[PDB]
């Protein structure tokens, strides 16, 4: 009927980690290669995603217990989940009115047609937009949003992880926090936790479709040369 | 006392290749990550150099006989000479008045202090600027400028080349053209060819110093992650 001190301490750490790694002013975006509307948007979106990967790494390093995993597991979790965390965290810029991601500037407003000009198809972008709208409609508290990103990150059912038992125990404790938070602090949230776990399933499906379409980019050197080294590393197929 | 049709045909091809790969409007530069004046200039200069590598490859493919070399030799020549051709071709933007490289815009004006903010030291930048001023003082005809870039590219005394005899024969014919051009067409150029060959020696020394300083960037992942895949490939140490 009430959250414990340890549960609250987890929430505080995760909220702080998100506020430290998500800059609502979007002022760093002027440093990316500019948007162009031949894959005219691939340079700008590559830079955006590369920047976002660095933020997700910074967020992950502040999740309780992530830092204490082996280096191989930390890499395994980030390589499998990075694209999902980016899709999740981008909801904070998504607008139901514009049906687009809005980042404090008309040049940094991204609609579906922009992403087609980076090598992706409606087979990815239609479920992605439907995901954003459904997730936005849940009206998650920031507490619930950061818990979901952490739960998504600390999934043991990802390729390459060795210490399944350790990661599952971390993810278990985060799920307990989220269920308790919704019950005590989220008025009328009886069906919310189930909906949030459904979104984790949706992300798996978006992850697969993105990986398939990213293989086409990475197999064509005139396109892969537009990516960043960090993107090449994290979305690449190297195994530690 | 007069240039032959084959010598003139070589000059025409090289001038055309340079005009096709060097855009005096510099309008593409707005697509680079912006300049910032922590290595604040490394993103913009990485993009500039990566762009310039693509142009040098395009220029090389139109040098008579380059295209007919083996793929390994074409790569060997480009990996060893790319930085030298870029230093040579950048003279077209260099100003004796400003002591800087000027590209049709104040944001795209590069002085020595800009390059220090990309990880390089005066041990490279002082000889580089002295090279640009001495080369500018030669007042080369565009014919002589493009011949020198081609001669520099088709040097057989570069690591990794296998067909020394083929490349030397190509470079020999280009040297014959340049010597004849200066004698017939360059008033008062008695000492010019010797000075131009000296500049090729200077470039070797700048190449060595740049490679040494580039190793520091490429050994620090927070800096190498700012480079482009093409720069990583061409300036890297992989051997075919």
């Amino acid at each position: 009927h009430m959250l414990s001190d340890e549960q609250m301490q987890i929430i505080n750490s995760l909220v702080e980690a998100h506020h430290k790694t998500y800059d609502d002013s979007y002022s760093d975006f002027v440093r990316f290669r500019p948007p162009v509307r031949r894959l005219s948007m691939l340079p700008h979106l590559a830079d955006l995603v590369s920047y976002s990967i660095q933020k997700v790494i910074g967020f992950a390093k502040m999740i309780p217990g992530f830092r204490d995993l082996t280096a191989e597991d930390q890499i395994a979790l980030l390589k499998s989940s990075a694209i999902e965390i980016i899709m999740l965290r981008s909801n904070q810029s998504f607008s139901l009115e514009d049906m687009s991601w809005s980042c404090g500037g008309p040049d940094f407003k991204y609609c579906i047609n922009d992403v087609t000009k980076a090598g992706h198809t409606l087979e990815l972008l239609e479920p992605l937009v439907k995901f954003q709208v459904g997730l936005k409609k849940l009206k998650l508290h920031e507490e619930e949003h950061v818990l979901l990103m952490a739960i998504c990150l600390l999934s043991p059912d990802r390729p390459g992880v060795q210490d399944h038992v350790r990661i599952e125990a971390l993810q278990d404790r985060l799920c307990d926090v989220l269920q308790a938070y919704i019950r005590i602090q989220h008025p009328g949230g009886r069906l919310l936790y189930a909906k949030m776990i459904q979104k984790l399933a949706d992300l798996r499906s978006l992850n697969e479709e993105h990986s398939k379409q990213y293989r086409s980019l990475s197999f064509q050197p005139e396109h892969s040369m537009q990516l960043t080294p960090l993107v090449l590393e994290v979305f690449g197929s190297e195994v530690s | 006392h007069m240039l032959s049709d084959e010598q003139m045909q070589i000059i025409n091809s090289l001038v055309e290749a340079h005009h096709k790969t060097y855009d005096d409007s510099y309008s593409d530069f707005v697509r680079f990550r912006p300049p910032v004046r922590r290595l604040s200039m490394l993103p913009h200069l990485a993009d500039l150099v990566s762009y310039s590598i693509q142009k040098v490859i395009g220029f090389a493919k139109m040098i008579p006989g380059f295209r007919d070399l083996t793929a390994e030799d074409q790569i060997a020549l480009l990996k060893s000479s790319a930085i030298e051709i870029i230093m040579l071709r950048s003279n077209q933007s260099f100003s004796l008045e400003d002591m800087s490289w000027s590209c049709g815009g104040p944001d795209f004006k590069y002085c020595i202090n800009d390059v220090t903010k990309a990880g390089h030291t005066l041990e490279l930048l002082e000889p580089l600027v002295k090279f640009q001023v001495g080369l500018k003082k030669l007042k080369l005809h565009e014919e002589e400028h493009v011949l020198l870039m081609a001669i520099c590219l088709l040097s057989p005394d570069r690591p990794g080349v296998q067909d020394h005899v083929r490349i030397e024969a190509l470079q020999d014919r280009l040297c014959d053209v340049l010597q004849a051009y200066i004698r017939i067409q360059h008033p008062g150029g008695r000492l010019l060819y010797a000075k131009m060959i000296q500049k090729l020696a200077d470039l070797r020394s700048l190449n060595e110093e740049h490679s040494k300083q580039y190793r520091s960037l490429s050994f620090q992942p927070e800096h190498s992650m700012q480079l482009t895949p093409l720069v990583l490939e061409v300036f890297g140490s992989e051997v075919s």
Binding site: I57, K61, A71, I75, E233, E238 | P221, M225
Partner: peptide, 10 residues
């Protein structure tokens, strides 16, 4: 391999 990731993970 994973040169940059290792660096960023400190």
């Amino acid at each position: 391999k994973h040169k940059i990731l290792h660096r960023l993970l400190q």
